[PDB]
Symmetry: D2
Subunit: 116 residues, 4 copies
């Protein structure tokens, strides 16, 4: 599991459950090619997006569908979605966790990049 | 000044100076049209991006060029840029401040929306 | 104005108004002595806490009364308060801005330290 | 495991490993009584702090010894320590995770409160 996404809710103090997450890889012509997607679990995590063989160096975009998340909870949100855009680099560690902390008018994100 | 950007550096405990910012607006064909750009001052603030007349209703993307910022300080950061994507002015004209807090492997952003 | 506090609300996308702040300084006996207090204005800012003369070197604790803030808006938050504890002026006088971003179950804080 | 602490490093993009964490419970006379302590693991987590029988309702303080963390990595930090102060309430969920994201001049914290 070289790529994991973990989403938390700063209003409810809970995992962000059943959030849609789409990953894209930047193509040669600078367009965004669908790569992987899924919905966060009851723990706010999304595992199994890709495999070591599929996850090559390059620029990736993780889109988190925050607007749908907030409106399913009855909350008015600011953003259309959250975006995390980063380069995967085979130098240094090989497991990427993209973590996001959501509020209606704000979000935080960090990267946790490690070896097993 | 209906759109402003303010950026802080969480490593230095200082304004983030000379941060490039590019604003896009979603066009009729659903592409991202360049709208405005500038860079943060010595105070970490970017004023004068647009006008009340030109800042019409739409979906806007504020790209904050965090990689360029960190590389210019000699640091190899995680992200390519921070994105803030939102619908603006859909209940009439508002003033938006996009605030960001930067670290090499993490950033936060918030919006301050006021009615003049 | 060598110590200032600025607070934003990540649910409302607005300044956090009428936030009570209490500042303490560690005394010779290692207890927390009350130093100064105030509350955020309509802009989310708190000016006039102290003076250059009175703001001597020491360990300071800035308590931001987040529970009181959220309860006054009818919300039952997680935290009692946010604390920011730091040594001030140990390389000579500096100006400190303590910035905070509030959600009901989460907060962020940063320091902006400048040399006048 | 009713109380867990999880610490991440926003400069290195890693867990915050071998950080000292002290938990206190507020006594009747408003002093802070030592309650539990430990050091974060290789995953930035601290498990086994307390037991259901020991963790009663009341106000708790989680101190994270960030200053020692940063100076063991050769980094100049702002804060003396990070503080998280909250009420444990048997109404609603019974597992508390206190998560913290560290930068030299900033920190974020959230609460993830759940049932199994
Ligand atoms: C204080 C803070 C800030 C940010 C951007 C993420 C998180 C966070 C998000 C998801 C998670 C996942 C990995 C978890 O809860 O196990 C952990 C976190 F510390 C916490
Ligand atoms: C994204 C983020 C994170 C944190 C901890 C503070 C702030 C913040 C708080 C107050 C202000 C005030 C001083 C302002 O200039 O609007 C600015 C900020 F960027 C923004």
């Amino acid at each position: 599991c070289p790529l994991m996404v973990k989403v938390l809710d700063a209003v409810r103090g809970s995992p962000a459950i059943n959030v849609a997450v789409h990953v894209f890889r930047k193509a040669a012509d600078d367009t965004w090619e669908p790569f992987a997607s899924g919905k966060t679990s009851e723990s706010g995590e999304l595992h199994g997006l890709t495999t070591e063989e599929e996850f090559v160096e390059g620029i990736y975009k993780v889109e988190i569908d925050t607007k749908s998340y907030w409106k399913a909870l009855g909350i008015s949100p600011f953003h259309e979605h959250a975006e995390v855009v980063f380069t995967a680099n085979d130098s240094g560690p090989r497991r990427y966790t993209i973590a996001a902390l959501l509020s209606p008018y704000s979000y935080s994100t960090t990267a946790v990049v490690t070896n097993p």
